[PDB]
Design a protein around this ligand. Structure first.
Ligand code: SRM
Ligand code: SF4
Ligand SMILES: [Cl-]
Ligand SMILES: [Cl-]
Ligand SMILES: [K+]
Length: 538
């Protein structure tokens, strides 16, 4: 690699970071949008106030403003559902470590409630909240309301740092390695500039995902993150070994690889900054499918990339990885649904199943009520789109289990439901090829009616090749497609994936059978479960 390849391609100009004039040739259309107007100005210079007053029909009449609502607003966590819910916006938060409060939950519920049939909310595969139904004129007030309850939606979509994922059992599990909350909190504060915006990390070549590991279970899925912090002692000091480059895409799925770097615990933010600066400064900005950070690592080689991180560390120091980390390979992933004792004597947490992560305003209020009556007003989200309510005095559990809402959001649903994960799908998502959430519930219910089993089989349903529901991690995965019935009629289908493993012995699954009509999946899945997962016909 020539020395010229290492010239930073962006520069700071008036508080924002822009592509240098000599690096603008051949860039993709999204890069052109970012050059035409800095997206962060919508928040940091309050551009949203005037934009929100323009009728959407007028907005659509000029490229600049249409790009504002369809592209730039994703820097404020707002996602125009142009195709499938025209004029409405999904809104996505920062929620480091999946931690929310009852007050925040009620606030989000009050927002979606206003929108009636156009509103609802979802737990995401990054243990995050999305709300739906938002209209542009309400955006300024919603931004204010979020801030009032201690939430931000900054930099949650497009070419930004995604929600920092941590251990859902952080601080409460007798078996945790290290509480991940302080680190995910710090990362979120760094990324968003303490909820004011951080332009230094908002003009990346592409999305970028971080997680901090604190569980032997590896609930955080470090193998699929762009940066994963693996807890490790080195020379008698606590810190993290670093894995880099994990990502999924239609084109390519790759597990994270060692950077061959260890940092002391206090260097979590400095090294996040150094890696992001290297990616920002040096990453390809052509074909969007070749812009994720792993592509830069392949171009420079991992050592070449490492040197770029190192030069951007304070005092330009970056130690090599510790030979061992603290994660025990002898481990069985633990079910967190149901009632479990905390490390604090006399306290329990309860994991509740949220069917395909979907909730209405009334459901959110009820969950918030439970967290107040039984817990400490805290609700935690998980990457399987479930919830945990921690800090419940154990003597209260008997009463809790009798609460009517637990018949819907159950501490002990059937085993296949426990592991079921599904993306948004075509109810709202314009990329989706099929409907996912309703279909996956229906099929899973029919399958479980036919077979019993004891193995915790994890089924993931994703609506298109973007694989937001991570079919490549599933025991059985379903990727949306259109296919044909016996008469040659167009029908919704799924490509079925097998072979995904999580935890320390991770592995990426691959397509096993293409183009199966959705109406034909039940017998296929029943047979797979009996033949490969020890299921028994009822
Ligand atoms: C909500 C969520 C799925 C879910 O039901 O939980 C989702 C939703 C969408 N994703 Fe994603 N992604 C979700 C996690 C993921 C993950 C999984 C993960 O992070 O572990 C991936 C695969 C892992 C990865 O990217 O490395 C993922 C891969 C993408 C991709 C493909 C990325 C690529 O490099 O090609 C896009 C489209 C793109 O960027 O080209 C996409 C684009 C989208 C958009 C924003 C497209 C759009 O504007 O319509 C989806 C919004 C639909 C909607 O209305 O909800 N989404 N997306 C997840 C929100 C996470 C969060 O809170 O931030
Ligand atoms: S996998 Fe496809 S259909 Fe599902 S939310 Fe992501 S982009 Fe939409
Ligand atoms: Cl996005
Ligand atoms: Cl759309
Ligand atoms: K769920």
């Amino acid at each position: 690699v020539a020395a010229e390849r290492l010239e930073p391609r962006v520069e700071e100009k008036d508080g924002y970071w822009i592509l240098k004039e000599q690096f603008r040739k051949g860039i993709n259309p999204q890069e052109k949008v970012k050059i035409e107007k800095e997206p962060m100005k919508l928040f940091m210079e309050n551009g949203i106030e005037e934009l929100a007053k323009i009728p959407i029909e007028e907005i659509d009449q000029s490229k600049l403003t249409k790009d504002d609502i369809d592209v730039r607003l994703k820097w404020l966590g707002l996602f125009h559902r142009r195709k499938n819910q025209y004029g409405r916006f999904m809104m996505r938060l920062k929620l480091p470590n999946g931690v929310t409060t009852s007050a925040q939950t009620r606030y989000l519920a009050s927002v979606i409630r206003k929108y009636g049939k156009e509103g609802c909310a979802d737990i995401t595969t990054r243990q995050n909240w999305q709300i739906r139904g938002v209209v542009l004129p309400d955006v300024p007030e919603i931004l204010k309301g979020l801030a009032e309850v201690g939430l931000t939606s900054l930099q949650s979509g497009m070419d930004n740092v995604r929600n920092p994922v941590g251990n859902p059992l952080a601080g409460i599990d007798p078996e945790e390695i290290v509480d991940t909350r302080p680190y995910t909190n710090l990362l979120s504060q760094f990324i968003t500039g303490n909820s004011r915006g951080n332009p230094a990390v908002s003009n990346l070549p592409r999305k970028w995902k971080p997680c901090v590991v604190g569980s032997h279970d590896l609930y955080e899925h470090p193998h699929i993150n762009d940066l994963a912090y693996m807890p490790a002692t080195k020379d008698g000091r606590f810190g993290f070994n670093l894995l880099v480059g994990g990502f999924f895409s239609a084109k390519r799925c790759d597990e994270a690889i060692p950077l061959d770097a260890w940092v002391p615990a206090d260097d979590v933010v400095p090294v996040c900054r150094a890696i992001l600066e290297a990616f920002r400064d040096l990453g390809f900005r052509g074909n969007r499918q070749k812009c994720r950070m792993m592509w830069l690592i392949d171009e420079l080689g991992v050592e070449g990339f490492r040197a770029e991180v190192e030069k951007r560390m304070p005092q330009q120091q970056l130690e090599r990885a510790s030979p061992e980390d603290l994660v025990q390979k002898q481990w069985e992933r633990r079910d967190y649904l149901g009632v479990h004792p905390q490390k604090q004597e006399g306290y329990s947490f309860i994991g509740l199943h949220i069917p395909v992560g979907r909730v209405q305003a009334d459901d959110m209020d009820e969950l918030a009520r439970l967290a107040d009556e039984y817990g400490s007003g805290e609700i935690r989200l998980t990457v399987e789109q479930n919830i945990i309510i921690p800090n419940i005095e154990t003597s209260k559990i008997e009463a809790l289990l009798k609460e009517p809402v637990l018949s819907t959001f159950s501490p002990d649903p059937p085993i296949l439901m426990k592991g079921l994960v599904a993306c948004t799908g075509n109810q709202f998502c314009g990329q989706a090829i099929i409907e996912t959430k309703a279909r996956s519930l229906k099929i899973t219910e029919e399958v479980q009616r036919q077979v019993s089993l004891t193995k915790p089989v994890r089924m993931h349903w994703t609506g298109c090749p973007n694989t937001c529901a991570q079919v490549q991690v599933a025991d059985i995965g379903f990727m949306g497609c259109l296919t044909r019935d016996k008469n040659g009629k167009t029908v919704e289908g799924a490509d079925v994936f097998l072979g995904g493993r999580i935890g320390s012995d991770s592995h990426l699954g691959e397509v096993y059978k293409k183009a199966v009509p959705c109406d034909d999946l039940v017998p296929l899945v029943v047979d797979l479960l009996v033949n490969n997962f020890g299921a028994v016909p009822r």
